[PDB]
Curated annotation (Swiss-Prot), chain A:
Top-level taxon of origin: Eukaryota
Assembly mode: Homotetramer. Can also form heterotetramers with RYR1 and RYR3. Interacts with FKBP1A and FKBP1B; these interactions may stabilize the channel in its closed state and prevent Ca(2+) leaks. Interacts with CALM and S100A1; these interactions regulate channel activity. Identified in a complex composed of RYR2, FKBP1B, PKA catalytic subunit, PRKAR2A, AKAP6, and the protein phosphatases PP2A and PP1. Interacts directly with FKBP1B, PKA, PP1 and PP2A. Interacts with SELENON. In cardiac muscles, identified in a complex, composed of FSD2, CMYA5 and RYR2.
Associated pathology: Ventricular tachycardia, catecholaminergic polymorphic, 1, with or without atrial dysfunction and/or dilated cardiomyopathy: An arrhythmogenic disorder characterized by stress-induced, bidirectional ventricular tachycardia that may degenerate into cardiac arrest and cause sudden death. Patients present with recurrent syncope, seizures, or sudden death after physical activity or emotional stress. CPVT1 inheritance is autosomal dominant. Ventricular arrhythmias due to cardiac ryanodine receptor calcium release deficiency syndrome: An autosomal dominant arrhythmogenic disorder characterized by syncope, cardiac arrest and/or sudden unexpected death, often in association with physical exertion or acute emotional stress. Patients who survive manifest polymorphic ventricular tachycardia and ventricular fibrillation. Unlike typical catecholaminergic ventricular tachycardia, arrhythmias are not reproducible on exercise stress testing or adrenaline challenge.
Protein name, entry field: Ryanodine receptor 2
Protein's gene: RYR2
Comment field on protein domains: The calcium release channel activity resides in the C-terminal region while the remaining part of the protein resides in the cytoplasm.
Organism: Homo sapiens (Human)
Record's note on what induces expression: By TGFB1.
Tissue: Detected in heart muscle (at protein level). Heart muscle, brain (cerebellum and hippocampus) and placenta.
Length: 292, 48
């Protein structure tokens, strides 16, 4: 895809084509989660769910991965694209947090899709109290007459009520880290929350004030190297507490999800903060389960 | 074929067309774009 060129110059039929491509995918996975909630007991809707997990999730994940790796989306974002993206985010986050026999089969798939989506999306969503600073936000775009025109709750917290905020999520993950809760009891957190924080902090590093003493407090969001330090320390210390038990390929993949963060982090911290990592990974000489 | 799928007859009048598509055209797209990642991804930054 080259949506930059397509959007700057291209035909409105093509515009509406990809707009319908994303709208239809949205309504598809929303109707999928709905019929899954009404699917308390175990066929057409089941086929829709299977089609979702096999095709709709991979394509959205891949196109958002390309968007993220091109540092893309700021011009891609247009009318109703915000609304579709927020709906999709709430949907797959709801499935990831929810527990069902359907969820435990492809919960990894939604995990990678949400990891791609959170980075790909061009507006800071996990922070909402000072998010007004972004002119690219649809709230700044819509003035008031367009707000009255389109059916949206006019409050960012109301549009995504189920999702929590960054500070409460980081304090909760620190709490579960120090408590050392096993992955089996609450797979959803260690399955979806970590890709959230990873992608979010990876792409709003530079849309944080630490790179940018300039335009300070005109930032779309506020972030710190100490936030990065805290949460990758949490990742290393949770893996510390839980390679001994329950093992699993999920810790094998959170390594590659945390790879951007370990490239991001500065090297003086690397020295004497991942020296613990190398010794903790090898202290289980008796075990054979793969790590990193 | 979706319209005729509601019919009992599963025989497809354009079976040659659909097999040619699935066996050649769809993989032809695959090989062409995987060989030409960069060419369509030109972004005025003079890539190659």
């Amino acid at each position: 895809l080259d949506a930059r060129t397509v959007m700057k110059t291209g035909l409105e039929s093509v515009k509406s084509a990809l707009r319908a491509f994303l709208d239809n995918a949205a309504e598809d996975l929303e109707k999928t989660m709905e019929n899954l909630k009404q699917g308390q007991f175990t066929k057409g809707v089941t086929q829709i769910i299977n089609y979702t997990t096999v095709a709709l999730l991979p394509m959205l994940s891949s196109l958002f991965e390309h968007i993220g790796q091109h540092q893309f989306g700021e011009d891609l974002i247009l009318e109703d694209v915000q609304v579709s993206c927020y709906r999709i985010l709430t949907s797959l986050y709801a499935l990831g947090t929810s527990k069902s026999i359907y969820v435990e089969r492809q919960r990894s798939a939604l995990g990678e899709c949400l990891a791609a989506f959170a980075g790909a999306f061009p507006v800071a969503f996990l922070e909402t109290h000072l998010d007004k600073h972004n002119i690219y936000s649809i709230y700044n775009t819509k003035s008031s007459r367009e707000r009255a025109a389109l059916s949206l709750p006019t409050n960012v917290e109301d549009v995504c009520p189920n999702i929590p905020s960054l500070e409460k999520l980081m304090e909760e993950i620190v709490e579960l880290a120090e408590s050392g809760i096993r992955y089996t009891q609450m797979p959803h957190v260690m399955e979806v929350i970590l890709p959230m924080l990873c992608s979010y902090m990876s792409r709003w590093w530079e849309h944080g004030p630490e790179n940018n003493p300039e335009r300070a407090e005109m930032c779309c969001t506020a972030l710190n190297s100490e936030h990065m330090n805290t949460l990758l320390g949490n990742i290393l210390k949770i893996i510390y507490n839980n390679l001994g038990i329950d093992e699993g390929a999920w810790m094998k993949r959170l390594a590659v999800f945390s790879q951007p963060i370990i490239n991001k982090v500065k090297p003086q911290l690397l020295k004497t903060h991942f020296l613990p990592l190398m010794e903790k990974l090898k202290k289980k000489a008796a075990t054979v389960v793969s790590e990193e | 074929f979706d319209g005729g799928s509601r019919g009992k007859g599963e025989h497809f009048p354009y079976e040659q067309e659909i097999k040619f598509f699935a066996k050649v055209v769809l993989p032809l797209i695959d090989q062409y774009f995987k060989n030409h990642r960069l060419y369509f991804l030109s972004a005025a930054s003079r890539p190659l």
